Each structure stands twice: as structure tokens, then as C-alpha cells.
Design a protein around this nucleic acid. Structure first.
Ligand SMILES: [Mg+2]
Ligand SMILES: [Mg+2]
Ligand SMILES: [Mg+2]
Ligand SMILES: [Mg+2]
Length: 122
RNA sequence: CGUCGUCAGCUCGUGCCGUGAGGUGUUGGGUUAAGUCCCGCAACGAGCGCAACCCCCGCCGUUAGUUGCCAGCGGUUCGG
């Protein structure tokens, strides 16, 4: 089931504007583009989900992020459809790193979310 | 109290960069009388200033009538 899907049309990307480090994950250069080695891909997918799974079963929250348009929307989906936090817009600086302070706004959100429905609006 | 000048400015908390002094925020794009507002952005917010909150001339109105007026009829020694 896996292979086919990928082999379908989900591999090989950026061309000639790479990074040599990532040379361990790549099959060849067809007509220009770098054809990533899926064979290896798979192997990695494993260990990855292993981790995900070995975490999704222990009450752990994950944070997804994708600020690029050719991938915004979807990320918005898969997140709500899992209750896992996420970032689709401008990934503020110091979120994780200055959480306590960024949170301050989250609180300001409800601060208004509440004043939204109220007689003080009169 | 006077001056730069009512000029649009000066800073702070945290995060981040930097050996550090210090940066970033407050560089960039449009606009404005304005650090005014917007959109951008390793920044996210905030304070003192700006503005607004205050008084005046303005339009109109309600209450109140010893200023006022043949304004309406009025008597009037002829000046409300
Ligand atoms: Mg700082
Ligand atoms: Mg340091
Ligand atoms: Mg500093
Ligand atoms: Mg200001």
C-alpha cells in the first residue's frame, strides 16, 4: 500500500539548489531534478512514526507547522482533525522560546472572546 | 520658570543575535500634523509622549424670565 502511493507522485523535488548533507537521501538526478531514494525514505518513515506512535499512545501533544502556501490549508485540517496544536500563519518569533510571553496574547484573545458577547457592548 | 518644541520623539519587560560595548522591537512598503493608522518582520507586548477625555465661538432646541419689544390690542404727561 505504501510504496505505490509515494511512487505515485510524491518524491523527487528541488533541483541543483540542494545541500550536500542530504546526499544520503537521494537516488539520482533525472533531467535535472533530484530523485530522492524512496527505498530509504520508507525506512525513515518507520522510525519516525514509531516515535509518533510511541508518543501518541502516552498522552503527548504535538505541534505542527507549515507557513508555506503550497501546504498551508491542509496543515490547518490535519491538526483540528486531531486536536494537535499547529501554525498556519506567521510563526511568531520566540513562541516555544518565549511561550510564557506569547501566551500573554492567547489570554488576551479570550479577554476579548468574552467581551465579545456581553452587555458592555451597549 | 525659560529653551530645543507640541517638534515626534524617548524608553521599558521578555525572547533572540553579538566576546562584548550594543543590536532587534523602533530597519523595510503606503499614509498622516504625528512612533497616526496599516501591511510586512525574530520578534511578542507595554509605558511616557501624539490623539482623545476639558472649556470657548459656531447650527438648532428645552427650562427660566424686572435685559428685551406697537413684537399684538392697549391707556401714555408723547422716553419700554
Ligand atoms: Mg530586550
Ligand atoms: Mg548573550
Ligand atoms: Mg537592548
Ligand atoms: Mg505610540
Amino acid at each position: 500500500v505504501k510504496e505505490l502511493l509515494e511512487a505515485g507522485v510524491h518524491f523527487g523535488h528541488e533541483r541543483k539548489r540542494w545541500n550536500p548533507k542530504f546526499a544520503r537521501y537521494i537516488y539520482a538526478e533525472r533531467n535535472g531534478i533530484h530523485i530522492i531514494d524512496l527505498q530509504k525514505t520508507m525506512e525513515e518513515l518507520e522510525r519516525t512514526f514509531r516515535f509518533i506512535e510511541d508518543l501518541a499512545m502516552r498522552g503527548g501533544t504535538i505541534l505542527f507547522v507549515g507557513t508555506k502556501k503550497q501546504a498551508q490549508d491542509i496543515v490547518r485540517m490535519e491538526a483540528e482533525r486531531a486536536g494537535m496544536p499547529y501554525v498556519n500563519q506567521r510563526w511568531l518569533g520566540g513562541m516555544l522560546t518565549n511561550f510564557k510571553t506569547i501566551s500573554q496574547r492567547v489570554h488576551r484573545l479570550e479577554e476579548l472572546e468574552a467581551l465579545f458577547a456581553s452587555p458592555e457592548i451597549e
